[PDB]
Design a binder for these strands. Structure first.
Ligand SMILES: [Mg+2]
Ligand SMILES: [Mg+2]
Ligand SMILES: [Mg+2]
Ligand SMILES: [Zn+2]
Lengths: 128, 136, 125, 37
RNA sequence: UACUAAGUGGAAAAGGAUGUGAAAGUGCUAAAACAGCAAGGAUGUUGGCUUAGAAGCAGCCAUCGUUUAAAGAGUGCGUAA
């Protein structure tokens, strides 16, 4: 099992795969085939590395707290937790939650709502 | 180096450290304190070592008080000098610590750091130290 | 304390009294990711997987005036899989998952005021 | 082995024992063997 | 009648130690205690600045939240990371 970082538009390189026995050249087409709907975005892949050779792979969403920055209309969050700069309402929080519901292992959507508050607190953005 | 700014008399008689505790007997500024169990003469050099030790092992918000102060001076005749021809010149300042005087106290930081801080302060002093707390 | 334990035994006894299906499982070699996956695949309020104490389960069973389950809860690792209304689909789901697992045991459970055996659990799916 | 007048555990794995009426400290790391406690 | 296992007795300090005896309190325990053994020990994610890089284990912005029995921005080792 390997959690490898591969660009959606550029995933053909990577020597580490060759150490396990993965058929790199056949699987490059599979890597590129199902990521064209999210071209440009960086997408890591989880690989069920084993000796079966039929390596099933699963894509993965870009990491959180960059859409928080996008919605807060600021490039980088505050360098002090006490200092509050960005403000985010519940509507932007819920759009982020339904977007990131795919990668999250939470059963409900309110759990996903308060994940956004939790990472926003880390970013320092007031939850209004 | 704690040192009195001026003194009326340069060469006073030494002050005994034998006896119980006159003042500075109970923690009254902080709430943990370093009590002594053996009266002895400790000089301003040992205070500075202990104070610097406490400050280095303190944090960003801890606060400390130094109770004892080296009021009394002591002299020392120069080497290779035969007895006579008056008393020697003052050399170092010593604070008189009796059995039971609280020398250092600390507060405003968790208990473990305070216990550790008092330990490193007491390892710098000749007296046999002990930890005490402030009455509620 | 003792009062909290009394409250706990009472409510689990009430829950198993008002329930309709139960099956016991072990906790040998399955991941927490897999545990969250089982919770989401069930997704039914009637179906519930829970870690119960072995002692508390026997005492709640004693208060439930049932019999014969003692052999299940002896010198073993116990899970509880309570099902409300329909329990066949829950058993089918858990059976498919243990087949998807690497290794797993399976201990007799209780349903419809009757008890079953290990092979009876194999056919109850 | 380090011979010191005072012996105390260095890591959490260091364990104090008393062998042949002498207290020593043994541990996985051999840099931390102490004696003459 | 107790104590010492050191020939202490029959010389010594700062400091160190699961030596042993006595006492006074407090926590859990046959609704199972402690140690050990057998299992799991999570998700967003590898959060984000930051650093060539750190993303469970460089300094940080701090020191998140759900599922859940439990899980830590981790316990270390360790990986350029
Ligand atoms: Mg002798
Ligand atoms: Mg001892
Ligand atoms: Mg004793
Ligand atoms: Zn060690």
């Amino acid at each position: 099992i390997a959690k490898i970082n591969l660009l959606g538009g550029q995933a053909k390189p990577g020597p580490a795969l060759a150490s396990v026995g993965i058929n790199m050249g056949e699987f490059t087409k599979q890597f590129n085939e199902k990521t064209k709907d999210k071209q440009g975005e960086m997408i890591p892949c989880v690989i069920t590395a084993y000796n079966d050779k039929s390596f099933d792979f699963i894509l993965k969403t870009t990491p959180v707290s960059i859409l928080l920055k996008q919605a807060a209309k600021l490039e980088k969050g505050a360098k002090n937790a006490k200092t509050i700069v960005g403000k985010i309402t519940m509507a932007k929080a819920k759009e982020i939650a339904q977007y990131k519901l795919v990668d999250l292992n939470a059963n409900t959507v309110e759990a996903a709502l308060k994940m956004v508050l939790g990472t926003a607190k880390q970013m320092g953005i007031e939850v209004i | 180096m704690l040192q009195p700014k001026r003194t009326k008399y340069r060469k006073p008689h030494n002050v005994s450290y034998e006896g119980k505790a006159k003042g500075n007997s109970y923690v009254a500024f902080g709430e943990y304190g370093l009590v002594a169990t053996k009266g002895n003469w400790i000089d301003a050099r040992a205070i500075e070592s202990a104070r610097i030790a406490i400050s280095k092992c303190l944090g960003k918000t801890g606060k400390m008080w130094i109770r004892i102060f080296p009021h009394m001076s002591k002299t020392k005749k120069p080497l290779e000098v035969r007895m006579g021809s008056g008393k020697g010149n003052p050399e170092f300042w010593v604070a008189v610590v009796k059995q039971g005087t609280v020398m250092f106290e600390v507060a405003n930081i968790p208990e473990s750091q305070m216990i550790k801080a008092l330990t490193r302060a007491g390892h710098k002093l000749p007296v046999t130290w002990k930890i005490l707390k402030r009455e509620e | 304390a003792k009062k909290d334990k009394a409250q706990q035994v009472a409510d689990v006894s009430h829950l198993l009294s008002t329930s309709a299906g139960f099956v016991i499982f072990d906790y040998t070699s399955m991941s927490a990711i897999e545990a969250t996956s089982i919770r989401k695949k069930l997704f039914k309020n009637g179906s519930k997987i829970k870690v119960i104490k072995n002692n508390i389960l026997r005492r709640a069973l004693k208060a439930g005036k049932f019999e014969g389950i003692d052999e299940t809860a002896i010198k073993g690792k116990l899970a509880v899989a309570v099902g409300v209304n329909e329990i066949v689909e829950t058993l089918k789901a858990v059976d498919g998952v243990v087949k998807a697992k690497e290794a797993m045991n399976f201990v007799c459970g209780y349903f419809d005021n009757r008890a079953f055996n290990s092979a009876d659990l194999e056919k109850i799916a | 082995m380090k011979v010191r007048a005072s012996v105390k555990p260095i890591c959490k794995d260091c364990k104090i024992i008393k062998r042949h009426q002498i207290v020593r400290v043994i541990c996985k790391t051999q840099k931390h063997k102490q004696r003459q406690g």
